[PDB]
Design a protein around this ligand. Sequence first.
Ligand SMILES: Nc1ncnc2c1ncn2[C@@H]1O[C@H](COP(=O)(O)OP(=O)(O)NP(=O)(O)O)[C@@H](O)[C@H]1O
Ligand SMILES: Nc1ncnc2c1ncn2[C@@H]1O[C@H](COP(=O)(O)OP(=O)(O)NP(=O)(O)O)[C@@H](O)[C@H]1O
Ligand SMILES: Cc1ncc(C[n+]2csc(CCOP(=O)(O)OP(=O)(O)O)c2C)c(N)n1
Ligand SMILES: Cc1ncc(C[n+]2csc(CCOP(=O)(O)OP(=O)(O)O)c2C)c(N)n1
Ligand SMILES: [Mg+2]
Ligand SMILES: [Mg+2]
Lengths: 788, 788
Amino acid sequence: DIATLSPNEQAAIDAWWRAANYLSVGQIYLRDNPLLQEPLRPEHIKQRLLGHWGSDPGLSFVYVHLNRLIRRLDLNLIYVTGPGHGAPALLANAWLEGTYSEVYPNCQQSTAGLQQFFKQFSFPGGIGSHCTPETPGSIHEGGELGYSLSHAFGAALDNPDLIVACVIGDGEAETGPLATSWHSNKFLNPAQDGAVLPILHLNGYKIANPTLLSRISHEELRSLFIGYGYEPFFVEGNDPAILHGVMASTLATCVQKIQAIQAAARSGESSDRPMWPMIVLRTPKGWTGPATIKGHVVEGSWRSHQVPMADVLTNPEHLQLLEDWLRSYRPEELFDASGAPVAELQAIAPIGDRRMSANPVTNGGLLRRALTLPDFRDQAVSVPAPGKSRADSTRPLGQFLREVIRHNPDNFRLFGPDETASNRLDAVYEVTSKVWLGDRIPEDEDGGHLSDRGRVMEILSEHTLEGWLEAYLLTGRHGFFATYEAFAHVIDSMVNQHAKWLDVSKREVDWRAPVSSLNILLSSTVWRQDHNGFSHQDPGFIDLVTNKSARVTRIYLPPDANCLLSVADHCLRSTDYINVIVADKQSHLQYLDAEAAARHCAKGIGIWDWASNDQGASPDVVIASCGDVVTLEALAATALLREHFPDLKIRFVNVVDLFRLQPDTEHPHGLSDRDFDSLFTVDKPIIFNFHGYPWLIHKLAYRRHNHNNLHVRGYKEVGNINTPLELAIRNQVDRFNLAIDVIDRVPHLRDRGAHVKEWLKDQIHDHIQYAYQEGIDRPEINQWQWPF
Amino acid sequence: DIATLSPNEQAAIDAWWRAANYLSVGQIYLRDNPLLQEPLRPEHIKQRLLGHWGSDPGLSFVYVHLNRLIRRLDLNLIYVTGPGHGAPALLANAWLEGTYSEVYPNCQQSTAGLQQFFKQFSFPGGIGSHCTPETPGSIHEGGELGYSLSHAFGAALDNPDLIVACVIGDGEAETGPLATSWHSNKFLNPAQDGAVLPILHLNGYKIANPTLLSRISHEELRSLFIGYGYEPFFVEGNDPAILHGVMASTLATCVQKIQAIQAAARSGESSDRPMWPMIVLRTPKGWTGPATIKGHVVEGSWRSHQVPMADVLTNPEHLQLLEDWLRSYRPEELFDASGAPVAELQAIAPIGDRRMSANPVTNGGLLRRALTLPDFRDQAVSVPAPGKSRADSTRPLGQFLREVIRHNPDNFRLFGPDETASNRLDAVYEVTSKVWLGDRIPEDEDGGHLSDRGRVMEILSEHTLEGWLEAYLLTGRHGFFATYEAFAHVIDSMVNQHAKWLDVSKREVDWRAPVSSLNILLSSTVWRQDHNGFSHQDPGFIDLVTNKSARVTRIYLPPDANCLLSVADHCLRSTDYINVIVADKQSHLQYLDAEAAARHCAKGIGIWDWASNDQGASPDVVIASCGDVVTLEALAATALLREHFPDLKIRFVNVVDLFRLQPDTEHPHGLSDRDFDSLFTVDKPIIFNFHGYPWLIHKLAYRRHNHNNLHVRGYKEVGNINTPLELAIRNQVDRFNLAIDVIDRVPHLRDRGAHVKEWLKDQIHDHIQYAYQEGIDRPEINQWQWPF
Ligand SMILES: Nc1ncnc2c1ncn2[C@@H]1O[C@H](COP(=O)(O)OP(=O)(O)NP(=O)(O)O)[C@@H](O)[C@H]1O
Ligand SMILES: Nc1ncnc2c1ncn2[C@@H]1O[C@H](COP(=O)(O)OP(=O)(O)NP(=O)(O)O)[C@@H](O)[C@H]1O
Ligand SMILES: Cc1ncc(C[n+]2csc(CCOP(=O)(O)OP(=O)(O)O)c2C)c(N)n1
Ligand SMILES: Cc1ncc(C[n+]2csc(CCOP(=O)(O)OP(=O)(O)O)c2C)c(N)n1
Ligand SMILES: [Mg+2]
Ligand SMILES: [Mg+2]
């Protein structure tokens, strides 16, 4: 009798829904007099209304019916809200369950608690209008639309007993990222992962337009979700007396199908991909709000999206409508004299960690277990002599990540947009494979690396991969994201959203435990351009990330393979950060052995003694590099200057942790003035070679005592199909251009360096001509090794 | 008999396809000996192979069959290529048609022309590996995937006789932007617009993984495209002798259905949304290439994506396979002794502007007609006294765009993500409406503003709107894009792609005519936060645009409504630029009348005489602003300083064209040192108030003679739910913080300004406290007017 809804049971469910709707309206409008004991006066009304109403009745309607199944079936549910502007609905249900009073004791169940609960919403010094980290039971705010469903599937990974109910706005379903994320059911393994129950809140409008999903035919809407791989169930209507029974029947059927799917998969019976149930809920927008305002239809219209009436403070006619709207929920029957919800409502609230707002999954940092990291020195390459041996930079990292996967079989995942093979991380395929629940063919057995239980997620949507990983981290797990630097601008908005979530959680919300870091590896750079990737690719993603402070993000540019291992090992232990690691995958010179790499990465920035020439003396010039390809040209420029100017003293500095250039006043992570002046002197020229836009170095280190001697050479522009040396010449980061820059900058080389400067320009001409004749660089350039 | 393919006609079509495939392989591999007259030696082979092979046979297969219908039905087709890495297929077919020889006379039809044609591809000093602007008949490079389909619909707008054939790679179909762009058929009016014939190139793989669209069941794939609103036709096979007739039949059926749809709609017989035909083409990847390499399957596998053999240069065995691969196309039967294609191939080539590569639509700048712009002074607000009257800033712009739409009924469109009403541009609804082909209800007659022939495009996907507009401009039309600044990070990648296209077209490609500018209006700013928009919204899009230099991008921050009209009028006449206009929509003070606004916008930056105090004297301080909200605080700070320091002389400077801060050496648009020193003195402090990150002003004007006196205040962090004055206080751009900044910077106020500085701090405390207890600012702040 789980499907059938008792008339006695329906009354309590309906009463809860009215109470949830009443509190939603109170949060938007009222700042005083929560229960209308006295007549509603304009001094009780908020000024500058900012909350949204249209989506709230639908969100609360789903919430109360999900609570019914939790009590009856002991389900482990969480609630992911697509329309984040419907935050007051989520807070209202959290308050009714008692979760909000536990987390925030100032908002008690009493009347005085309701004064604070209403006053705080969308108010200065209170809380926001979206599902911010302050919201209990929230892993995602719907401020930026299109990422809700990918977050739902990210939370369901490796959570076999968890069912994630994702409510999706119909306008949000028009966005790019959301349309693709429907296909995430081809990467969800029913045997080992949880289930996502997507609910399409098809209220027909978004802000001022009808939504295209609502205005297509019912047959097209059904065919669309069959094509996405779902089994759609439609709950449509406008009468709550009818929709309560329909919604209860539909949700019960969906949960039974979900549990039947998981039971079949976990017995080794139906290992093929199933058709997951989904619900299309078609209800009026502003369902229980005012019917008409100023003669225009408001309920079931786009006019109820923000507020049915925004001028209640000015004219008494709309103030009376607001009071009539509030009294239509009959609050006298819902709250007792003390202000607490009546015992009828208390009986149907779930208990403990079953409440969808006290669920520990939504505060995943509490469930987080540190990774069992193997010693990365086992994968370290052998560097007997710095700058003389060649090795693939990312191949040791793949072997290291292979051992992380082996030792963390359910805690760690690797995310990549069909570039794991391209990024030369194939070593992870020796222990695991790529998850694939779609159809398989015998041709995939050769080198496909596909299985239903792979630890590597592979889909071409950068939005979907980022959504999966962000929710995977926020639910207490660990991950690693590997992609090309060219396609990093695609996830600019998603990274900004996650950076805001981490920053608010760490500073403003005390009860949210720290989660694992978002580790992004940009495995192919803009200097060693390969077959894939557009021509004018730029390192603009580094600049965008740096806009956020060192408080929440870090940039690492390891110069070789052993430094990449140390950086990856350190970042797999950090918690509240967005770690961006830039490392090219081409065969490169190796500089530091395992022990030197660990020391160098711990310092973030240091002097390379083997490449330096100024031991026990003041250097004539400081040559600094940041980036593997950039570092090679700086070293080659150093070797050229040592051969032609034997008396020239050069100090070589390598920067790995880019944010250490900022002064320690701006952030504790940065170098102090004494430390900065010890590395880069107080008066000598600094020739800084940078992998990225040169202006960024200036932005970070303008408050230094020697900023007037900081010369930065970096990315400017990319012409089509430059050879690696030709591209460096165009941007003037080449060995020859750097040597020319040193000759210009060093005061005592401005006359004696003229003949060398002319010879360097001849070399630039010769190599450019050879690149046009052959399409490749000379063997001497490709096989260059550090002399001395 | 158009559907049936003659055996004689099939032979020529097959011969053309082999010739196209032969030239694709030659472009990837050969740099000499185009027709194998002598044995293939390793010196004929390119070094650093960069072209892609897997997608080429499918692209050429579609191309030759489209040419058949052009010759038979006289269709006006263009070819939009999703897999841009399959560029050598497009160039090969352009060469066979003779288009490439006309555009590039160095690559003639002869054997000598083939030496240059093969040598240039993916070569330094040649052409790129994607469909760059150098490619004839290309409006879109498939470097960044996901935008091909939205570009196809943008080209079809207002082009009733045009059919756009868009080939979509199955890997590309997994991306976010492409998944939602299928719904563009709900905005494409059959009576007035063209038709898009999407062809899904379902070769089963993308780079190293099977595509999810290929591995779902046929019933799911069919249901997916029915749900998208299409009528899918499946062309599946691997034998070309059989697939040639199937493809010819399917394309003929699709075109007849398209013309039947347009004929029914243009007679007023049925104005309902039709089911547009689409084609699913399932062919092996690397279709005619080597079957197996090193014992692994290559044809019909992901291993053929880049190159079946990447080692032909080293070992002779692979070199022999390459020659056997080339001879499998039988080039002795396809090219004449002189190297021209045989007369059999010449017969089936289209003639003139029907060739899909000589189609003038793809070089839309040739078809561009300048807009009939009305005089914007008719919409100008009345400003009898600067800084005293108030008006909505964007409403005059809406009335101006209303008249632009009226005078350009088929040449101009407005694009917005359901924010036209929010951005207060409702005036455009007085002449036109929003295009909507979905189901309509009588409730839409009140304020829906929906019709099948609206000039305003309204979908919630920012990716789709940007794709529509970019192709609309590249085909020679005009448009205006209005959105929120908060959601501008969504289109970062798309704007980067369009910036590359404009920059290469203007500089490197001589035959491409200039197209209209991409005019982006960010109608809601981060300083006036409203109901919509997430908590932590930042002006980072301005920074990303400025990475592209002044050659291709311009940033305008008009201070009031009349300046917005002048900026919008000027930008509707510019051609090869990305114009970003930042203008808040809230009710603001008005400063310049119609004539003064036109003069100020022409200069880009100037001294406001009415707000200045230093006439005939050296100013003590220069107060500069850039942005409407920022300008208000700068003026209020100026008024405060005038009241408390009657002897203080203040020069007020307003910046509208942001790039004029750059020196004229960097770009001719920038101010010279003489002009910059006349506005901002050579030795006085400059208090610069900026709408955006302060570091950007430093980046633009670091090399100025008075940069040591430039003190910039801008956006730092928006926090959550701050009142407008409170948000300015947090970022220290408020009137009180600016006045404090002036007191510190001016040398003779450092002692006499101490008591005023304490009073200013007391005001900051008072307004913050009032904002916490009321949620709104004081009426004195809200109703502030310029005194004097
Ligand atoms: N003080 C500064 N503030 C902001 N950006 C700067 C500054 N100095 C240089 N830049 C930017 O960084 C790049 C390189 O400048 P810089 O690091 O000074 O090298 P440089 O060789 O000294 N060139 P210049 O300073 O013009 O003689 C340029 O493209 C500038 O846009
Ligand atoms: N070369 C530069 N000089 C000054 N500021 C810079 C430079 N490059 C970037 N900036 C940025 O500009 C912002 C604004 O600083 P600024 O305009 O100098 O104001 P200010 O009052 O002078 N503060 P300060 O310069 O540190 O004493 C800083 O926070 C930096 O992030
Ligand atoms: C990409 C994007 N564009 C625009 C917005 C602005 N916005 C916020 S809420 C909203 C309405 C869409 O709501 P819908 O998904 O229809 O939800 P419902 O009202 O049915 O809950 C819009 C356009 C946004 N958040 N994200
Ligand atoms: C968003 C994005 N991610 C990654 C890439 C890298 N890339 C370039 S070509 C390509 C293959 C796409 O496969 P598909 O569209 O099926 O092409 P086809 O099989 O026809 O070659 C990929 C992933 C890209 N261009 N865009
Ligand atoms: Mg909606
Ligand atoms: Mg493919």
